[PDB]
């Protein structure tokens, strides 16, 4: 395990430039998106929560392709507001239900220091 808690105040500093291997050591799901929502990084914990293969989703668009259930004002709308402002720091619960058993999660989206993080744990 990497020793980082979900929701930590300086999480973007701790995960800064973490490589794909170390990201796979986190206790929580971690996705890194570009400002368009394309997937740059996606860790093992997230693949375990959602069923997706962390190796295959890299390069797909999260909102258009992988996660249409997040293409909504409550998810994508918050993301894009944060991208446009260059300020993003929002934590909310959400249900993932596309081609999967509906799974409720706590989501933390936060601008990265490089890029935007989506951190995920079950609730």
Ligand X SMILES: *C(=O)/C=C/c1ccc(O)cc1
CB-based contact 16:112 (threshold 8 Å): yes
32 touches ligand X by CB under 6 A = no
**Residue 4 or 107 having the CB closest to ligand X:** 107
Nearest to 52 by CA among 38, 66, 40: 66
39 touches ligand X by CB under 6 A = no
88 touches ligand X by CB under 6 A = no
CB of residue 67 to ligand X, shortest distance in Å: 3
CB-based contact 4:11 (threshold 8 Å): yes
Binding ligand X (rule: CB under 6 A), the pick from 32, 41, 43, 50 is: 50
Q: How far is CA 28 from CA 48, 61, 65, 73, 110, in A?
A: 10, 21, 22, 24, 14
Applying CB under 6 A, which residues contact ligand X? 31, 46, 50, 52, 66-70, 96, 98
């Amino acid at each position: 395990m990497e020793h980082v808690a979900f929701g930590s105040e300086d999480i973007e500093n701790t995960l800064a430039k973490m490589d794909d291997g170390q990201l796979d050591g986190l206790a929580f799901g971690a996705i890194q998106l570009d400002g368009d929502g394309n997937i740059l990084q996606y860790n093992a914990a997230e693949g375990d929560i959602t069923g997706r293969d962390p190796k295959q989703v890299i390069g797909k668009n999260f909102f258009k392709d992988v996660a249409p259930c997040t293409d909504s004002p409550e998810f994508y709308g918050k993301f894009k507001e944060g991208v446009a402002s260059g300020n993003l720091n929002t934590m909310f619960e959400y249900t993932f239900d596309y081609q999967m058993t509906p799974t409720k999660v706590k989501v933390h989206m936060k601008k990265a220091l490089s890029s935007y993080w989506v951190f995920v744990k079950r609730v």
